[PDB]
Design a binder for this molecule. Structure first.
Ligand SMILES: [Mg+2]
Ligand SMILES: [Mg+2]
Ligand SMILES: [Mg+2]
Ligand SMILES: [Mg+2]
Ligand SMILES: [Mg+2]
Ligand SMILES: [Mg+2]
Ligand SMILES: [Mg+2]
Ligand SMILES: [Mg+2]
Ligand SMILES: [Mg+2]
Ligand SMILES: [Mg+2]
Ligand SMILES: [Mg+2]
Ligand SMILES: [Mg+2]
Ligand SMILES: [Mg+2]
Ligand SMILES: [Mg+2]
Ligand SMILES: [Mg+2]
Ligand SMILES: [Mg+2]
Ligand SMILES: [Mg+2]
Ligand SMILES: [Mg+2]
Ligand SMILES: [Mg+2]
Lengths: 218, 129, 88
RNA sequence: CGUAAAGCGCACGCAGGCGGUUUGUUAAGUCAGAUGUGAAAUCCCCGGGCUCAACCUGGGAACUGCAUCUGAUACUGGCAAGCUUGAGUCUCGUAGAGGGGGGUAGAAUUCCAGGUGUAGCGGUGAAAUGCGUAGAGAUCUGGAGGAAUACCGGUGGCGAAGGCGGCCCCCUGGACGAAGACUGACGCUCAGGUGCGAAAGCGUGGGGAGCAAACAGGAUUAGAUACCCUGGUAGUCCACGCCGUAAACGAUGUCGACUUGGAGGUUGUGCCCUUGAGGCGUGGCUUCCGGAGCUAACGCGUUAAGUCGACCGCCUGGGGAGUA
């Protein structure tokens, strides 16, 4: 049944009453979530997740923190999937139409990186323009092209991603997310208990989500 | 002070409901029961339960349908400070007809649909919808 | 506020037996006792305004209790006030 | 009715209102039916008559009411007998600036007396008035007197509110906890009524160090009936009796039931190799923060300003006036 070796639970006091039903913890000043209730939430989780991924999966593996950002620009990034691994530039969904050209400048630039003007102008402008592009790259990588409108959303840490999720809620976008003992649920349709800032429950489920979009209907 | 228990029922409900509370209990009585009945028989609660003898305990199982609580509102109407009584033709109908009014009569605690058919009337205990 | 020896004595003078402690008549009598005891504390002092509040309480408590009994068993009421000596 | 008009300064309680839970009885409240009555006109519905209309008229409908009779008994009221959780009584303890009385301690101030010692001290923004050559201030020693209790001391504790801080004894009120034992709805609220009620203020007597309305002097100022300075009387202290008001405020009436959380403070108590200065529970009170919810908003938020009930008090534009 279990597969999460050592993600057991996490998070001490800072608990959110509403996250009681998914708790059975009480180990030394910290809750262990209800392991045996998290897995029935891979059922439903990766299910309506894939059930749409074959209907065609457009995702947004949204998850930040200089401590798991790169481990999101991964097979999470790779597949039928888009992502954000830095500061969730607010209104990026709700104001996509303004931000849509924050994109044109990323391309119309890199498309021009080993092309267009580049080694020319000044060797001032140079890295003094790749700073324009470096900045853009993180926070606005995964976006690059959005071909199929943001369709579901998968987030690592419910509340830490206040804004992201809120926006979804506003635009009618499923929001699949894992929620720590401390975080507010109910912002999340398909809620996933368990730790949300340890190198494992990430990768595990993260990489496990990459494994279900990346395959649904050949 | 304990003075009005029927409001307390109506309330413990109203409250617990709003607290998405599974069940709820309280001191029982002939009267509390007759209503817990109509409440169930009209399908506002799952099912009641009286578990005692010297110190009886009414227990109601609440209901939640969509995400909401089934009982959208529950008010007193008569009360010690001010008793209400309606004749048959003057009986009230809640939410135009949807939801109901609990009226005690010379032939027992029954709804407004009920008492209206029975062709009588009494003390209108409370409103539910 | 009265002694265990003294309070006991009166339970045992008024109730069915020591243990029948909460009998109307007993309460009343052990109050009545403390009241009269007190009459000499507030004889001196007098400006013990605070303690006084407690004493009235004792009287108004006793008063309601005496009222109860009367309604209940009038027969027991009259005996009581006679024997305790009040209600001129 | 927190901050806009509005919670009585606080309490106790008569009348009054309201009242847990069970069975029987009653049939007053309540409900049902029947009968009678509810004048005609008017109103309203359908018609009819004046050339139309207003107007006139037929017939219904309606008069939501009242009474009488007979019934129904769930609720309320009455009578009866109970019940134990509401409320009391009982037992051993606990914490406390809760009250009343009496006793007592040290530190300082002022004063009185004396040693040493000598021209200043004191005060301000700066000054002066004041004080010192009859020796001041400074310092040391002895004494008198009154007033308040540093450190502890703390969003600490007690009380109904007012408000209560040295130490000790005596008298005394309340609150809380742990066991079970007793009474058995004895309860909640409360107009009228009664009690209490900071400071100031009044009356007779005391008492008087420091402080200080008034008043006097010195200054500042354009003026200075002030703020500052040097003085200082009522008063501030005690007993007895008055007065009855405060932003007497949480500007939030009392009682009860219900409703996610988080970190403390304080005070009981059960359990754990007491084997840790603790470990896990379980009551009372208290502070901060915050969820729903509530709010005009600020904010409140299990100590509600949320959700409901019982009763009381109070508001109805500003000024006039809490005046006549
Ligand atoms: Mg006001
Ligand atoms: Mg008040
Ligand atoms: Mg009853
Ligand atoms: Mg007529
Ligand atoms: Mg005509
Ligand atoms: Mg009855
Ligand atoms: Mg001295
Ligand atoms: Mg001296
Ligand atoms: Mg005591
Ligand atoms: Mg007085
Ligand atoms: Mg005075
Ligand atoms: Mg005087
Ligand atoms: Mg002066
Ligand atoms: Mg006043
Ligand atoms: Mg205050
Ligand atoms: Mg708060
Ligand atoms: Mg709390
Ligand atoms: Mg309230
Ligand atoms: Mg006047």
């Amino acid at each position: 049944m279990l597969k999460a070796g050592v993600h057991f639970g996490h998070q001490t006091r800072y608990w959110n009453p509403k996250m009681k039903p998914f708790i059975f913890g009480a180990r030394n000043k910290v809750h262990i979530i209800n392991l045996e209730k998290t897995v029935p939430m891979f059922n439903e989780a990766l299910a309506e997740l894939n059930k749409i991924a074959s209907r065609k999966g457009k995702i947004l593996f949204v998850g930040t923190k200089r401590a798991a950002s790169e481990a999101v620009k991964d097979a999470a990034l790779s597949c039928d999937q888009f992502f954000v691994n830095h500061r969730w530039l607010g209104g990026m969904l709700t104001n996509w139409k303004t931000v849509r050209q924050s994109i044109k400048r990323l391309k119309d630039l890199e498309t021009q990186s080993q092309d267009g003007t580049f080694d020319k102008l000044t060797k001032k402008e140079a890295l003094m323009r790749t700073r324009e592009l470096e900045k853009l790259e993180n926070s606005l990588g995964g976006i690059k092209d959005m071909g199929g409108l943001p369709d579901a959303l998968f987030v690592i840490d419910a509340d830490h991603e206040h804004i992201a999720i809120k926006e979804a809620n506003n635009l009618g976008i499923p929001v699949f997310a894992i929620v720590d003992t401390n975080s507010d649920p109910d912002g999340v349709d398909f809620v996933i208990p368990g730790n949300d800032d340890a190198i494992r429950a990430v990768t595990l489920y993260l990489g496990a989500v990459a494994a279900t979009v990346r395959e649904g209907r050949s | 002070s304990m003075q009005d228990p029927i409001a307390d029922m109506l309330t413990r409900i109203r409250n617990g409901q709003a607290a998405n509370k599974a069940a709820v209990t309280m001191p029982s009585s002939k009267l509390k029961v007759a209503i817990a009945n109509v409440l169930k028989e009209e399908g506002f609660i799952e099912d009641f339960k009286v578990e005692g003898d010297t110190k009886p305990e009414l227990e109601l199982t609440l209901k939640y349908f969509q995400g909401k609580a089934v009982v959208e509102s529950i008010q007193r109407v008569s009360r010690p400070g001010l008793r209400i009584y309606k004749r048959k033709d003057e009986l009230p109908k809640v939410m135009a007809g949807l939801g109901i009014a609990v009226v005690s009569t010379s032939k027992g605690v029954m709804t407004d649909r009920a008492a209206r058919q029975a062709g009588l009337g009494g003390e209108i205990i409370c409103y539910v919808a | 506020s009265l002694s265990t020896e003294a309070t006991a004595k009166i339970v045992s003078e008024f109730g069915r037996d020591a243990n029948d402690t909460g009998s109307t008549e007993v309460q009343v009598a052990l109050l009545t006792a403390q009241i009269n005891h007190l009459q000499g504390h507030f004889a001196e002092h007098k400006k013990d305004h605070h303690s006084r509040r407690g004493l009235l309480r004792m009287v108004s408590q006793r008063r309601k209790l005496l009222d109860y009994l009367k309604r209940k068993d009038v027969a027991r009421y009259t005996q009581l006030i006679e024997r305790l000596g009040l209600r001129r």
